[PDB]
């Protein structure tokens, strides 16, 4: 994948304004709420019995921050995403057996969370660049299946 000058500027520029802890918690909670079968991977986190319980669950919020933080490791060097995510690919494919369609669903949820956070600053062009980024990260995460 090639990154244009504009795409890199749209991604790094928005990233500096992201509230990693808040957006990360929101994205992970929406995944568990919008796509509830994903809750099967997170029984260790405890009470996921309602949207309220999920949104207020400390382990969910803690985990969302870690997930968005790794997205930031993609933002930092966009041309090395494959290697950056290789160990996480082993975890999700060889160990957890998460179907990669779920990587796409978390990426789409994150775009909606970013839209909610940035309102009209999340231009069509910015959405297009961030959708590209989440698709490239999901591809890198699925690498160990192939």
């Amino acid at each position: 994948v090639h990154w244009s000058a504009e795409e890199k500027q749209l991604i790094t520029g928005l990233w500096g304004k992201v509230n990693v802890a808040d957006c990360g918690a929101e994205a992970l909670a929406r995944l568990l709420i919008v796509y509830p079968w994903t809750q099967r991977f997170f029984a260790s986190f405890g009470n996921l019995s309602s949207p309220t319980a999920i949104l207020g669950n400390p382990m969910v919020r803690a985990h969302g921050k870690k997930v968005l933080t790794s997205f930031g490791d993609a933002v930092k060097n966009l041309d090395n995403i494959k290697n950056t995510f290789s160990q996480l690919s082993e975890l999700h494919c060889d160990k957890l057996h998460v179907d990669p369609e779920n990587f796409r669903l978390l990426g789409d949820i994150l775009i909606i969370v970013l839209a909610a956070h940035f309102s009209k600053d999340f231009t069509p062009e910015c959405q297009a660049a961030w959708q590209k980024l989440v698709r490239v990260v999901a591809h890198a995460l699925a690498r160990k299946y192939h």
């Binding site: 839209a115 909610a116 999340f122």
Partner: protein, 139 residues
């Protein structure tokens, strides 16, 4: 299968959508065409430059069909029955595209009504959009 809470959540947020059909529909299509460029292949007859009159007119019709499905949320297949024939039989829209349009619509709703698009409302709106997609692909 839309629950009773689902229908309540969908009609609730659709009260803010009504009256902005043209603006929200035009923005949903512009987002789809730039985020997912291959979707433009269904519209070779369109002027697809930003702000074109065909996009604004078409966007208005798309959101108007959604509002009509919301007002008849108990029987979506019947409300959108002739649209199914157009998309599945005449247009042959690949089913993956209805997810792309639905994604773009939720993005527009989040941009303009983030407080109304709570996780629960997002979940219900996702089921509604997937049901509409099922109808429009059912040939």
């Amino acid at each position: 299968v839309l629950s009773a809470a689902d229908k309540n959540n969908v009609k609730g947020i659709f009260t803010k959508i009504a009256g902005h059909a043209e603006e929200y529909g035009a923005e949903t299509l512009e987002r789809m065409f730039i985020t997912y460029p291959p979707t433009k292949t269904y519209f070779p007859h369109f002027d697809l430059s930003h702000g074109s009159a065909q996009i604004k007119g078409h966007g208005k019709k798309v959101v108007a069909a959604l509002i009509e499905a919301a007002n008849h949320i108990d029987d979506i297949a019947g409300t959108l029955s002739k649209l199914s024939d157009l998309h599945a039989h005449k247009l042959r829209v690949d089913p993956v595209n209805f997810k792309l349009l639905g994604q773009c619509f939720l993005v527009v709703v989040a941009i303009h009504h983030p407080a109304a698009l709570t996780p629960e409302v997002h979940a219900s709106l996702d089921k509604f959009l997937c049901a509409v997609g099922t109808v429009l692909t059912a040939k």
